[PDB]
Ligand binder design. Structure first.
Ligand code: 992
Ligand code: AMP
Ligand code: AMP
Ligand code: AMP
Lengths: 183, 298, 453
């Protein structure tokens, strides 16, 4: 089954759906509080359709339209194979989102032309200032908070060497590396 | 048998702590500064990063400290100039010399069998675990860490038959040419014994030959912590007096004692070797984590 | 004339969630009820949240916890996604409290233990719910609690903070109402504090008809604790409703509290006797089906419906047994807190020829923030750094490592710490190979730090 939703949100007392799939006969729609909907099994490819609301043909503003040689205007929807697998649909949708984001950046050297965010307290818990019980292996540390990972910590430059450290995850385990670099 | 397939089943990753700290030295760091950084950070070994080669080129351990002291020390009346002037890079140029001695490491996804194999083949006590995908060093693997890990699982498998055999019956450890120092032996002589016979610790014995103390390579770094490294004429006894109030004595074992007994004693005491003695405490040999891990992979 | 989606007839709206409309559905053969969350595709694209929906679908799909509403399938259409979920008939916890007044201590504790179990399950999966409240806790016919609406949830990323302020103010922690950055598991626990309070007393700890007044009460953190509650649970409330996020109780705190431990079922938390035999471990099912080539659905079928001696099952159980041995030596994998000394404990360094140096975060400077940034731009220009501007105070920097040929990336962020003093924070980015990613990050930071002054 390839379910396709036909939803009319514009109110009215009776709404019917007509299109190429039913040979342009009026299909009564189920009403919710507002929505009038039908979910049909449709083959992939192009389908033309129109809503009939309270005795009047009315187009759907949400979908594109097509005019025939004799002047009738219908909505058309496109049923694509990518619509029936959710991750294929999301991949298509994420491509359409990157496309609009092009018409609205690289690395560069130009500077920029409202206070800074307050520093969050978690970054002031310094894992190398914490003491460990003397009974355990001096290389063991407490489990870090996920939020302090990858941030740089340091000691004041003294005697020409700078010491840097940070905590990085490998799989489910955590390593705090110190580096002693002469300046 | 069964402990061998256990080692082959587990990657080194499983031995890595959940959270641990690791100290790296750039090769251009002054070697004296680096030994101090070991003391202040509480770790006994550091990986060595060469920022020109952009590669890990080796490890700095306490044995480097012992090697620098034994070679360049002259008298308590003069400074040891090469310890103050040497960068790690220049010291390695002097020490390494002819030996190829490239960096020995192991992947996190390699088996424990491969770790013990690497430790024994290269005769080292520290195998750095480098992740090949990020190039990062993760942890410094040791014999203690492998044995304690195995001890956790001995209840999970049928226990072999040799675990109940005595140390005498299995001939595990070194029973001949034991390197020892007397109670009055100066530190500098002990350092020389460390360099000549490559061994992790020297039992300290009285005049009649029974062990009153033990001088590990680890205890040498107290020379760095107390900055007493400039006088090596003092005795091993005076070098260990800082330890006297919390020292409970030398962990020993007899030859009639079972190998499982030995393993539990070492894992619980977290030291690298036991001193095998007789009734009267006179030393008949050494049994080390080297011997024990080697025997379990044979 | 019925609206069917994938064998289910769609009924009335149960409610409109944070994102999407939930309708009931009834199996056209067996009558089985489900709850169908509908998401409009065009809405998702217009908000550019496609990625957040995809990640939300991948995560809720592998979430299997008895107190989290399960997702059964997702049915895709040209215009809409349908998310078929477990239906529960008890309605909201909010309606239960309202109609009963207060809730008796033994039942209130049972519910709270179930709710907290699901929250801990989310956090251990790196998800924070952020909408926690009695209207989003549903009951089944048996009075078991189910957390439901994840529309506001977010993944917790390493090194990153959450800003977004949304949800009901009454359940909002003092930091979210202030607009500060937070880690996010602390904010869920605050909400569990308000739920616990609403469970025991029929009322909210912080409530006012005047909304700015409500915000002052929450920020102050003073609330009335009635005398019909015993003191142990009073301690548990003040620990969870603590105003300082660093002083606020964690899940491990709560699980160790005496009032919470009483009559606690063995299955709700991972360190507890019955957890392994009940709650599936998603990392072990991924591991077993790495060894054998099989789907995650086959491994779960031999555990649920299968014979214990199956090879998928024995592999799975063997991983769980090994992970129990390792977890039960925590001393071996983790440092303790402040006893015979470990043999490798080092003595302190003594003076010179000693003070304990203190690590600090990043770089502090008292220059005006616009002046700090200009010196950052100047230093990077001198160093051949290419960079992008997320905002005025946030930069994404990169440099080509000349030896390795790899690119190394970093995030610079400026913060306000004290009144007029500021701090520049350095954060690594990642995306066989020579060199080291962590060294590359240290040497890049080191270059920048020296150039400044
Ligand atoms: C809040 C919100 C969420 C989602 C949304 O998009 C959709 N609403 C839908 C409703 C239905 C629907 C409509 C009427 C129905 C049924 C079953 C019986 N009846 C009578 C299902 C369908 Cl088939 C797809 C939809 N897509 C629109 C809104 C909105 O803003 O209204
Ligand atoms: N993984 C390694 N790779 C290369 N050399 C090492 C390694 N581990 C130790 N060494 C060398 O061995 C000496 C000390 O050995 P150890 O007995 O492991 O402390 C050091 O001075 C190093 O030169
Ligand atoms: N003090 C010592 N005297 C003689 N042999 C030793 C001594 N310490 C260790 N050995 C042996 O040297 C090998 C490795 O020792 P270790 O340095 O403890 O790894 C093992 O075969 C030990 O039994
Ligand atoms: N058999 C032993 N008895 C008592 N202390 C020991 C023994 N082996 C090592 N130690 C001490 O344990 C610390 C670490 O030594 P190691 O076993 O070489 O790592 C040092 O303080 C040693 O002196």
């Amino acid at each position: 089954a390839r379910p396709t939703v036909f939803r009319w949100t514009g109110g009215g007392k009776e709404v019917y759906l007509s299109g190429s799939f039913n040979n342009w006969s009026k299909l009564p729609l189920t009403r919710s509080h507002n929505n009038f909907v039908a979910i049909l099994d449709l083959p992939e490819g192009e389908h033309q359709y129109k809503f009939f609301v309270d005795g009047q043909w009315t187009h759907d503003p949400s979908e594109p339209i097509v005019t025939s040689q004799l002047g009738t205007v219908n909505n058309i929807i496109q049923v694509k194979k990518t619509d029936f697998e959710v991750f294929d649909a999301l991949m298509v949708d994420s491509q359409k989102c990157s496309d609009v984001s092009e018409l609205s950046g690289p690395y560069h050297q130009e500077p920029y032309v409202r206070a800074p965010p307050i520093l969050p307290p978690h970054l002031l818990q310094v894992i190398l200032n914490k003491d460990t019980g003397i009974s355990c292996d001096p290389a063991l540390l407490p489990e870090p908070n996920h939020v302090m990972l990858n941030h740089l910590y340091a000691l004041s430059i003294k005697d020409g060497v700078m010491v840097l450290s940070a905590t990085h995850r490998y799989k489910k385990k955590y390593v705090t590396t110190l580096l002693y670099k002469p300046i | 048998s069964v402990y061998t397939s256990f080692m082959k089943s587990h990657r080194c990753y499983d031995l890595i702590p959940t959270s641990s700290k690791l100290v790296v030295f750039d090769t251009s760091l002054q070697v004296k500064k680096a030994f101090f950084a070991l003391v202040t950070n509480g770790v006994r070994a550091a990986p060595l990063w060469d920022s020109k080669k952009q590669s890990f080129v080796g490890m700095l351990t306490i044995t480097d400290f012992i090697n620098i002291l034994h070679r360049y020390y002259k008298s308590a009346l003069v400074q040891i100039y090469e310890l103050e002037e040497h960068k790690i890079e220049t010291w390695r140029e002097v020490y390494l010399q002819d030996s190829f001695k490239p960096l020995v490491c192991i992947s996190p996804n390699a088996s424990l069998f491969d770790a013990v194999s690497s430790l024994i083949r290269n005769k080292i006590h520290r195998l750095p675990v480098i992740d090949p995908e990020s190039g990062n060093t993760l942890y410094i693997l040791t014999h203690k860490r492998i044995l304690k890990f195995l001890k956790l699982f001995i209840t999970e498998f049928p226990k072999p038959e040799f675990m109940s055999k005595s140390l005498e019956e299995l001939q595990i450890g070194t029973y001949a040419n034991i390197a020892m120092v007397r109670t009055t032996t100066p530190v500098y002589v002990a350092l020389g014994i460390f360099v000549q016979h490559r061994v992790s610790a020297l039992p300290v014995v009285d005049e009649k030959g029974r062990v009153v103390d033990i001088y590990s390579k680890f205890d040498v770094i107290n020379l760095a912590a107390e900055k007493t490294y400039n006088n090596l004429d003092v005795s091993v006894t005076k070098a260990l007096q800082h330890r006297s109030h919390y020292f409970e004595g030398v962990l020993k074992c007899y030859l009639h004692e079972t190998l499982e007994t030995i393993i539990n004693r070492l894992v619980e005491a977290e030291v690298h070797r036991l001193v095998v003695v007789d009734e009267n405490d006179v030393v008949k040999g050494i049994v080390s984590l080297s011997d024990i891990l080697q025997a379990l992979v044979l | 004339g019925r609206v069917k989606i994938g064998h289910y007839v769609l009924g009335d709206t149960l409610g409109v969630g944070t994102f999407g409309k939930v309708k009931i559905g009834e199996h056209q053969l067996t009558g089985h009820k489900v709850a169908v969350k509908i998401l409009n595709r065009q809405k998702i694209r217009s908000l550019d949240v496609v990625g957040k929906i995809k990640r939300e679908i991948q995560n809720l799909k592998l979430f299997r916890h008895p107190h989290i509403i399960k997702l059964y399938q997702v049915i895709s259409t040209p215009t809409d996604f349908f998310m078929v979920m477990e239906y529960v008939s008890g309605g909201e916890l909010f309606d239960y409290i309202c109609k009963h007044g207060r809730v008796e201590e033994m039942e209130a504790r049972r519910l709270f233990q179930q709710i907290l179990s699901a929250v801990d399950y989310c956090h251990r999966h790196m998800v924070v719910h952020r909408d926690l409240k009695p209207e989003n806790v549903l009951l089944d016919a048996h009075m078991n609690a189910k957390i439901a609406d994840f529309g506001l949830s977010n993944m917790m990323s390493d090194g990153e903070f959450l800003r977004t302020s949304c949800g009901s103010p009454n359940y909002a922690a003092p930091e979210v109402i202030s607009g500060r950055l937070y880690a996010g598991p602390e904010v869920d626990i605050w909400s569990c504090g308000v739920i616990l309070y609403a469970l025991l007393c029929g009322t909210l700890p912080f409530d006012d008809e005047h909304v700015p007044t409500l915000f002052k009460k929450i920020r102050g953190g003073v609330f009335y604790i009635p005398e019909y509650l015993n003191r142990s649970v009073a301690t548990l409330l003040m620990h969870m409703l603590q105003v300082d996020p660093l002083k606020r109780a964690t899940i491990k705190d709560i699980r160790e509290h005496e009032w919470f431990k009483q009559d606690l079922p063995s299955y709700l938390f991972p360190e507890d006797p019955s957890y392994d035999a009940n709650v599936i471990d998603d990392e072990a099912v991924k591991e077993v089906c790495e060894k054998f080539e099989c789907t995650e659905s086959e491994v779960m079928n031999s555990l649920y419906s299968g014979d214990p001696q199956d090879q998928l099952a024995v592999a799975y159980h063997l991983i769980i047994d090994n992970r129990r041995i390792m977890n039960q030596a925590s001393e071996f994998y983790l440092a303790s807190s402040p006893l015979k000394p470990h043999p490798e404990r080092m003595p302190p360094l003594i003076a010179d020829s000693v003070k304990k140096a203190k690590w600090h975060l990043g770089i502090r400077s008292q220059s005006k923030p616009y002046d700090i940034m200009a010196e950052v731009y100047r230093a990077m220009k001198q160093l051949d750094f290419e960079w992008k501007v997320v905002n005025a105070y946030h930069l994404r920097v990169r440099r080509k490592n000349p030896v390795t040929g790899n690119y190394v990336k970093m995030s610079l962020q400026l913060y306000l710490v004290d009144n007029r003093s500021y701090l520049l924070d350095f954060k690594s980015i990642d995306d066989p190979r020579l060199g080291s990613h962590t060294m590359d990050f240290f040497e890049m930071c080191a270059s920048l730090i020296t150039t400044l002054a």
